[PDB]
Structures are given as C-alpha cells and as structure tokens.
Amino acid sequence: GSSGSSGEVPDLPEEPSETAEEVVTVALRCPNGRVLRRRFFKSWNSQVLLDWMMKVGYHKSLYRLSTSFPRRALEVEGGSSLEDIGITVDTVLNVEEKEQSSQSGPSSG
C-alpha cells in the first residue's frame, strides 16, 4: 500500500453523536435552497466552522456565517468558543455573500 505523492486536502473532525454532552445541532443554509444539519461540540471554536464551509464548497472570503431570526451578520472570534459567542443551544446558520467590491473611485472623509 505505497501510493505515490497524492494531493493535500483538509479534513473535518468526526462529527459528534446525539448523546455526546456539550454538543449542539447546527445547520447551514445554502443560498441555493438546500440545508445541511450537523452536530458540533460546545468547546470547539467558531474557527472550525470556516473549515466546514470550505468542505461543502464555499469559501469564507466569499461567504459568512449569520444567526437565525433575528438575522445578524456574525463574525467568528479567534478565541471565543461556539457557546461563548452564542451557540450554547441548537441554532441555525445562513451562509450569506460577504460584502465585497471589485471597483473604486469615490472617497469619503
């Protein structure tokens, strides 16, 4: 079983169980209409989310994670846990298009 030099690809940590403690149920809502649901410990860091997004086929620099109604543009925190930011209980996320611009000209003071 000695394969040549394969490509490099990231991998997500085996999803937790339904009985596992300190575990919530997060679901990502795609702009296409489909919705994926998965569990995630309450100790993990929002950061892990960014990785899960790149797996489904979406980039962070292209989309962002938002909360449910009231909907609000959330921004991962390099240090705060999922439950620390506000993911202590089952919540629903909505992958929205990040605010970008491929132009310039006007300048405000």
From Swiss-Prot:
Cell compartment(s), UniProt: Endoplasmic reticulum membrane
All residue ranges annotated as the UBX domain in the record: 19-95
Tissues of expression: Highly expressed in gonads. In testis, expressed in post-meiotic round spermatids, while in ovaries it is expressed in granulosa cells.
Quaternary structure, from the entry: Interacts with SYVN1 and VCP.
The protein's role, per its UniProt record: Involved in endoplasmic reticulum-associated degradation (ERAD) for misfolded lumenal proteins, possibly by tethering VCP to the endoplasmic reticulum membrane. May play a role in reproduction.
Protein name as annotated: UBX domain-containing protein 8
Taxonomic lineage of the native organism: Eukaryota, Metazoa, Chordata, Craniata, Vertebrata
Record gene name: Ubxn8
